[PDB]
Amino acid sequence: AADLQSSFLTLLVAQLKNQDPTNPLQNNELTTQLAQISTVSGIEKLNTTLGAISGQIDNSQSLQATTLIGHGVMVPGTTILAGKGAEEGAVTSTTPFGVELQQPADKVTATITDKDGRVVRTLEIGELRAGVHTFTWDGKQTDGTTVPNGSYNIAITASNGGTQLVAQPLQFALVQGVTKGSNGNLLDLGTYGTTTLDEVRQII
Amino acid sequence: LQSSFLTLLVAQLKNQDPTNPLQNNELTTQLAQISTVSGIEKLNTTLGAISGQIDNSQSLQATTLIGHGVMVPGTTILAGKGAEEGAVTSTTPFGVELQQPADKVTATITDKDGRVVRTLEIGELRAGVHTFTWDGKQTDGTTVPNGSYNIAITASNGGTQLVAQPLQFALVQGVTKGSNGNLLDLGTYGTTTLDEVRQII
Amino acid sequence: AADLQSSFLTLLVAQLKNQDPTNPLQNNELTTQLAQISTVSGIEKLNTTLGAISGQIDNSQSLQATTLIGHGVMVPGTTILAGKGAEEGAVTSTTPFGVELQQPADKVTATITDKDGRVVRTLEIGELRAGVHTFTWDGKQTDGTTVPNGSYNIAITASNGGTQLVAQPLQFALVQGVTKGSNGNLLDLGTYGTTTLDEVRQII
Amino acid sequence: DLQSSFLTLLVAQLKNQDPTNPLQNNELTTQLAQISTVSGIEKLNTTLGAISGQIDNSQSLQATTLIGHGVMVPGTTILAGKGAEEGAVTSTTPFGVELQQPADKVTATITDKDGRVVRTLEIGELRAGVHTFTWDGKQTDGTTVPNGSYNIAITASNGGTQLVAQPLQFALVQGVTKGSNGNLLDLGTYGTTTLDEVRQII
Amino acid sequence: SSFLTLLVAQLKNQDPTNPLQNNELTTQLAQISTVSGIEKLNTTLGAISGQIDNSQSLQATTLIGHGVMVPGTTILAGKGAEEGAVTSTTPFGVELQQPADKVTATITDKDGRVVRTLEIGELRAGVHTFTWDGKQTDGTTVPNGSYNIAITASNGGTQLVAQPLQFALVQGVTKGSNGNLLDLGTYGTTTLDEVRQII
The missing domain is CATH 2.60.40.4070 (Immunoglobulin-like)
Structure with a gap:
């Protein structure tokens, strides 16, 4: 989760520290970025959680393999x-x-x-x-x-x-x-x- | 997809107008949007492997049905x-x-x-x-x-x-x-x- | 859902064939390309995950029959x-x-x-x-x-x-x-x- | 009917500009940027229904799993x-x-x-x-x-x-x-x- | 209510010479709904992981006698x-x-x-x-x-x-x-x- 969140946090401080003082960026899009990063961070942990589900299903399949032992x-x-x-x-x-x-x-x-x-x-x-x-x-x-x-x-x-x-x-x-x-x-x-x-x- | 969306980001950077350059307040927005599609692609493939594993599980556990x-x-x-x-x-x-x-x-x-x-x-x-x-x-x-x-x-x-x-x-x-x-x-x-x-x- | 990527091109190809040379439209690629195309890709690929999860549900509903016979x-x-x-x-x-x-x-x-x-x-x-x-x-x-x-x-x-x-x-x-x-x-x-x-x- | 709440909101504030010509002709595509927004939720919430069905299948499998011990x-x-x-x-x-x-x-x-x-x-x-x-x-x-x-x-x-x-x-x-x-x-x-x-x- | 203190605080420096359009505010709320749905799925997926753990525990009872x-x-x-x-x-x-x-x-x-x-x-x-x-x-x-x-x-x-x-x-x-x-x-x-x- 923080693997991308820490990397995406450098993009906030890069945009905040590098805005044109004549024509700064409206804060309306700022919450969109934070919402978009949360969307990205939410998907990232979804993949991590799902991989654990795949491993658990593999272990359950290995356990179920004992049902047909001797065949x-x-x-x-x-x-x-x-x-x-x-x-x-x-x-x-x-x-x-x-x-x-x-x-x-x-x-x-x-x-x-x-x-x-x-x-x-x-x-x-x-x-x-x-x-x-x-x-x-x-x-x-x-x-x-x-x-x-x-x-x-x-x-x-x-x-x-x-x-x-x-x-x-x-x-x-x-x-x-x-x-x-x-x-x-x-x-x-x-x-x-x-x-x-x-x-x-x-x-x- | 993630690669094919970077090229559309690389193209703009190397083809932005020289004397009227584009605003700088979208790079992290676009990348995060790009990273959204790439994340779903990782999700989408992993669901298929789950479907295959479920199919294999259904194929197994059926020795009782075979006997019956x-x-x-x-x-x-x-x-x-x-x-x-x-x-x-x-x-x-x-x-x-x-x-x-x-x-x-x-x-x-x-x-x-x-x-x-x-x-x-x-x-x-x-x-x-x-x-x-x-x-x-x-x-x-x-x-x-x-x-x-x-x-x-x-x-x-x-x-x-x-x-x-x-x-x-x-x-x-x-x-x-x-x-x-x-x-x-x-x-x-x-x-x-x-x-x-x-x-x- | 797939009509978004096809109604997007029809409008786009219109603006490309109807540019005014003195006032060319650089918003064709300013945000229109990377933001909306990916936003289409966000939803169009959420069709598959819903389809994939539906297929997984279809597989899972047969596991009840795959299981043992009630005593x-x-x-x-x-x-x-x-x-x-x-x-x-x-x-x-x-x-x-x-x-x-x-x-x-x-x-x-x-x-x-x-x-x-x-x-x-x-x-x-x-x-x-x-x-x-x-x-x-x-x-x-x-x-x-x-x-x-x-x-x-x-x-x-x-x-x-x-x-x-x-x-x-x-x-x-x-x-x-x-x-x-x-x-x-x-x-x-x-x-x-x-x-x-x-x-x-x-x-x- | 949510499409009409914005598709006709667009073409009730665009079917007037063309008369009076404050034309940009280029923000016109915000219709699609909004339909993908309403649909982008229409599939996440419905995904919660499928995942709940999967949960129900999980309890059904737990119930089917029976042992005399x-x-x-x-x-x-x-x-x-x-x-x-x-x-x-x-x-x-x-x-x-x-x-x-x-x-x-x-x-x-x-x-x-x-x-x-x-x-x-x-x-x-x-x-x-x-x-x-x-x-x-x-x-x-x-x-x-x-x-x-x-x-x-x-x-x-x-x-x-x-x-x-x-x-x-x-x-x-x-x-x-x-x-x-x-x-x-x-x-x-x-x-x-x-x-x-x-x-x-x- | 994470993206709500941010949302309420956004409506202060609102700058009537260039305010939140309806399109941005509707998008901003909808984009928040996207985050909420994913997190709701994420908490839901953990329950399925626990159910799978229970199922494998029930499957492991065949080891008894083996x-x-x-x-x-x-x-x-x-x-x-x-x-x-x-x-x-x-x-x-x-x-x-x-x-x-x-x-x-x-x-x-x-x-x-x-x-x-x-x-x-x-x-x-x-x-x-x-x-x-x-x-x-x-x-x-x-x-x-x-x-x-x-x-x-x-x-x-x-x-x-x-x-x-x-x-x-x-x-x-x-x-x-x-x-x-x-x-x-x-x-x-x-x-x-x-x-x-x-x-």
Whole structure:
């Protein structure tokens, strides 16, 4: 508040000490300046108070992150876990993936690759709309064979009449805790690391 | 804006009349007015970040809704039978929003082939939202086969048709931050706006 | 609000095309530019903050639905539901009732009648202050035997200094849904209908 | 209609100058400098309406926030009882003390309904703030206390001078009541109290 | 009434040869109304900040029943009363501010005798949470009790100041001398900001 008020007070003493003695300034505008400075000082403290509200909302969001502890979220990343449960006959399931598109794309190709780099399958369902579209891969080879359990990565390329689009890959990431680090309060995803709450696009 | 208003202040200083110079009793007034617009710009952007954080908060805290089932706009109703012996046929509840109260409300339930299987009369429904649970039985009184059915709701008051929008129940699987955010991903149905979501059960 | 910056230019462009060379108008830029254009910018950008706060209100009104589902609130009414559990020997329990008092009363009496209307119980709760007080009927009639299962009417008469006070009867209501009316988020009590947050005297 | 109070005030004192030609032709734009003035308030005052709606949303969210837990509230009542199971160990509601000064000599004396002391608890040194302990439910001799209620008195002293002590007791939250002032934590036996007056939420 | 003593005192040196015009006086009053409205909003915003503080305090009650990561070297090991129960140890952690590649956790029993040595490895700057398997050096089941953990982090042959962390179950939320505090029971009373991680 006084950061500008002290600086704006030098403008009063500069106008009072530097007025033409022949044609001085009417005091009618003097109260306008003081009213205008109070307007400026009022806005300045409004921003300061509102930033504290933003920080408090961030802290409340970090606290609310404990509600879905033990579940998983889709955040910017490419790591994919494929596997099956201990019960016999479990189909090899692939952890859900997703694509975030700034603009809708009429041709989106999503190719999944294993740890060895071998292409396991490419998905051609059609267009994918703008926003976050998430899918749960069936965990099957290109010929229908169940994928080996392990790590996978998806490359998603979108085209608009031959012109590409920049997209954000997202992967299911189970959160095992909420850790207050150097920047803010992030979500520990375990293997995927720690991530803040603002990049969380979709949860499961 | 703050920069673009300084240039209009710099222009006057370097283009003021040489032998008839302008008065000096406005520089702090104009700057304070300039500093007013710059202050609001800092306010205006910060409000947007608050809106984004509120959107993210709405996206979160919805794991309870994901676990529960909600009713979404649509004409779909799912009917099924349990695998246990003597299981009672289950049917997804539906609803309708009425801007104005109506005296004659007709619910026509049809199979996926479009053939009318059930016709129901509800009666008087006041302005607001109404919920119903279909018995899973067609017109003849027999249990309908398990599957998806289309419901058309027509609400009229004194022979004048009113807006009646049938609702669909579906299970939630996730909450999506799409192009705008707060989408209710359910699986087969897709994503649903939280505001357009009717009720949570 | 946006017409200020467009009706300002039409008047301005007039004075620029109609200057008198002998008497050129230097008040085009004396105060007209920096003071009025910014004063327009003060109001035209207060449109957005009102719009931004309106959008934030629109987002916030859905947080009521985003929150948990009501497990039963305490609302005005006189209906009390009584019944017996499936297990043998279960003690009959009744839905709680209560009274809202504008001022404390030196006597508080409760009359419980069955569906037939005859008085089945008289209760002396005691002394209560100004506010909402909630209690639960034991399910016992005047003679102390088990009351028949069903619906009962509770009427609470409270007076201070021999003068009857405004005593509002209140009944329990189980919340079952989160409705959205033409006014905002509302709670659904099922049989009782829909209720508003403001009229909810207490939540159980 | 405030525009007409000045728009027609301008064009009732300008629709005469043009006849009589005291023309400046250049102050004429003061109409806009005044419309932006009346509108510049028309949006601040209406912003107060939106911010009040946000406040109302804040109370609505506070009301929706509901938890079934226990709290620590001023009082001297300590309950003791046994479960329906055979051989259950008597458990007592936790008590406590709020001290605005650190205390080194603190004694918790527990008396029964008869008034006699059943158990005396030696707490010891306590720092500034709220401390919450749990009574073991046993008398001085170590015997299990009878089921019922007891009065706790906590005496706190620092350097030989007795300090003012606030006895505390556990209370299960039973609801949130919307009174004439707002949300009150209806605790049942204890009654209703504000969130701030709760020493500790357990 | 700040801009009212100024306003009343302005009407004294009023100079009838050039007085307050109606435009200036109306503007001056309206400009005062601008200041009043902003200040009314400013006081209003503080109430919303308090409401947000209350809301986050209510949200923090979920921490009860969940354990925080707090500075300390104590790990509790215990075995369930049921038959065949495997002894389990409370999770611990490490807080670092410099990149480290060689981290050793020396776990000793209540008597101080080294019972386990663990090589964690490379850790980035921040809070890292780990769980002791409950097995001592020879692999046998450790007895139930308290264990002291010394965490030494080093990078390229020089040791880094490593802050050991430990599990502490949150027992309640206290309104202390400053505000919301986390009473962890055995560990005591702690605040929100120091919480390394919630489990």
